[PDB]
């Protein structure tokens, strides 16, 4: 006898709203909200996660970073409990495109068990979507480099979820990175 709370729906609704104009960079140009959901869903379904603070955190694992939202909006809306994990998985968009990816490999291990979960999911889902389907106007080379970078981050996040990481490795095995 389970069920999401009113806070979780107000969060799902929020991410949906706040990303309303953002789209995933694919041929179809599918809504970006799908991503965040795929990410939050991976943890629920695949990672069998039963804690909303993580499921809502994942729903917002790109708002304060790709939207015009702030940790405060999240804070005054969903509390510090989740403002923490959303901050723990948000990049400093004041740093150059590359400096953030390089920093993602370093700060990886230092993260928390809960934040590592989101980080792995964010990766897994992105990869699943990158296999075969190449981003809009994306160099075929660049398409590979992501895989290289993704694994480097995923390698410093290990020890978190056996199942998520497993599936991740299955994506690197096929491609030929391990």
- Identify the bridge partners of residue 23 per DSSP, sorted by sequence position: 31
User: Quick one: what does residue 150 bind among Mn ion, its own copies, none, with the CB cut-off 5 to 8 Å set by partner type?
Assistant: none
Phi first, then psi: what are they for 62, rounded to 5°?
A: -160, -5
Considering 46, 66, 75, 169, which one is annotated as catalytic?
66
Closest approach of Cβ 62 to Mn ion, in Å?
5
The reply to whether 52 sits near Mn ion by the rule CB under 5 A is: no
In the DSSP assignment, the letter for residue 134 is P
How many CB atoms are closer than 10 A to CB 135?
15
Which single residue is written with the structure tokens 């920093």? 103
Residues of the binding site for Mn(2+): 35, 61-62, 122
Print burial letters for 84-101: b (CB count within 10 Å at least 16), e (below 16).
Answer: bbbebbbbeeeeeeeeeb
What is the rounded CA–CA span in Å between residue 7 and residue 140? 42
Closest approach of Cβ 169 to its own copies, in Å?
22
The reply to whether 62 sits near Mn ion by the rule CB under 5 A is: yes
Q: Are 121 and 164 a contacting pair, CB within 8 Å?
A: yes
Among positions 25-54, residues that touch its own copies (CB under 8 A) are 28, 30-31, 33-34, 37-38, 40-41, 44-45, 48, 50-52
What is the rounded CA–CA span in Å between residue 84 and residue 177? 33
**Is residue 125 flagged as an active site residue?**
no
**Cβ proximity to its own copies, 55 vs 108, nearer residue:** 55
**Is residue 66 flagged as an active site residue?**
yes
The reply to whether 132 sits near its own copies by the rule CB under 8 A is: no
Considering 46, 65, 129, 155, which one is annotated as catalytic?
65
> Could you say which of 111, 122, 124, 130 contacts Mn ion (CB under 5 A)?
122
What is the rounded CA–CA span in Å between residue 151 and residue 142? 14
Instruction: Output the six-digit token pair for 50.
Output: 């039963």
Where does this chain bind its own copies (CB under 8 A)? 2-6, 8-10, 12-13, 16-17, 20-21, 28, 30-31, 33-34, 37-38, 40-41, 44-45, 48, 50-52, 55
Where does this chain bind Mn ion (CB under 5 A)? 62, 122
Active site residues: 65-66
């Amino acid at each position: 006898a389970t069920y999401p709370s009113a806070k979780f729906m107000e969060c799902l609704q929020y991410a949906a709203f706040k990303h309303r104009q953002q789209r995933r960079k694919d041929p179809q140009e599918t809504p970006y909200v799908n991503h965040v959901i795929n990410v939050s869903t991976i943890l629920s379904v695949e990672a069998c996660i039963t804690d909303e603070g993580v499921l809502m955190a994942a729903l917002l694992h790109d708002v304060v970073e790709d939207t015009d939202a702030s940790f405060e909006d999240v804070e005054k809306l969903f509390g510090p409990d989740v403002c923490g994990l959303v901050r723990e998985v948000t990049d400093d968009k004041s740093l150059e495109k590359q400096e953030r990816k390089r920093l993602q490999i370093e700060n990886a291990a230092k993260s928390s068990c809960r934040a590592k979960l989101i980080k792995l999911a964010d990766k897994l889902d992105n990869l699943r979507d990158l296999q075969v389907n190449t981003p809009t106007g994306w160099t075929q080379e660049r398409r590979d480099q992501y895989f290289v970078w993704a694994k480097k981050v995923v390698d410093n996040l290990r020890g978190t979820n056996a199942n998520l990481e497993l599936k991740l490795d299955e994506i690197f095995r096929q491609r030929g990175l391990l």
